[PDB]
Symmetry: C2
């Protein structure tokens, strides 16, 4: 986690609040005296400063969201690899327990963004990626489990790592789409 962005985000809201005031008054003085040269330009320069403040806010707010998502992402990432490298059906069962929820949270956040991404293509990648992720997390479990029981069947290891590979890919796919709009 990193709340430096949540802190920055509030400060941003202040400038938007201050500028918003200066805008309100300049706007008022203009409405009462609309044929006024001076009063008008003051309203324009106000509107400009209000615009900068507002875009700086919207952009920053978007980072905050994407970032938040990416952190849940790196969590699930390391989980998948820790699940693969499990050496006992002990730690393996331990991990899967710790990871399942972390996969669910990531799934939720993922869904949300999916909604906000504008172009539908990206929205599809998100959906698809979240699907594979959803389906294989369990399968990777049963797969890397088998390898632990039949240590000499190279065929199982190959299978497991293929599932892991695809799973990791879905994770990045989610990350990739998440930064679309």
């Amino acid at each position: 986690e990193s709340q430096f962005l949540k802190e920055e985000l509030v400060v941003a809201v202040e400038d938007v609040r201050k500028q918003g005031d200066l805008m309100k008054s300049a706007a008022g003085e203009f409405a009462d005296d609309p044929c006024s040269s001076v009063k008008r330009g003051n309203m324009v320069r106000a509107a400009r400063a209000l615009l900068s403040a507002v875009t700086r806010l919207l952009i920053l707010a978007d980072m905050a969201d994407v970032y938040k998502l990416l952190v849940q992402l790196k969590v699930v990432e390391d989980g998948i690899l820790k699940l693969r490298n499990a050496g006992n059906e002990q730690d393996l069962g331990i991990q899967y327990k710790a990871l399942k929820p972390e996969v669910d949270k990531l799934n939720i956040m993922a869904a949300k963004r999916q909604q906000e991404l504008k172009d539908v293509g990206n929205r599809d990648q998100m959906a698809a990626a979240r699907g594979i992720l959803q389906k294989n997390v369990p399968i990777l479990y049963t797969a890397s489990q088998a390898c632990l029981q039949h240590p000499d069947v190279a065929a199982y290891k190959a299978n497991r790592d293929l599932i892991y590979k695809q799973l990791q890919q879905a994770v990045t796919g989610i990350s990739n789409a998440a930064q679309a709009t």
Copy 2:
């Protein structure tokens, strides 16, 4: 003249005023409860609507200015042609009187925009164009005057029309630069 834009411009200021309010409150509720999911999104959607309203305003305000300038422009335009086609040193002297001020007003407005245009090149065209305009309006007078005194000297007519041509060009140059930034 056309004040439909001055009217539209006020209505525009209202939406910016209304949205500005909705922004202020959503912004406030967020600052008091910043870790809030809901309160936050409300602040974002507010900021969006505030942004549309503000840009719609700034653009419209810019048209209003450019348009205003263009109207003084069409005035000076017809003046220059009416000065050329004068048939007596009577009407000619009449026109020049009526036009001189109209050239000065146009000159003032021109100067202003010059300041606001961002890229310097355009700012130069404006300056240059305003210069030629400034210098030749008088010369066109003395020129189209001579033609009236020596009606059979094709050479004078040629000269006069050349001055008129250049003068008209400066006018359009002003118009052209004025719509730069």
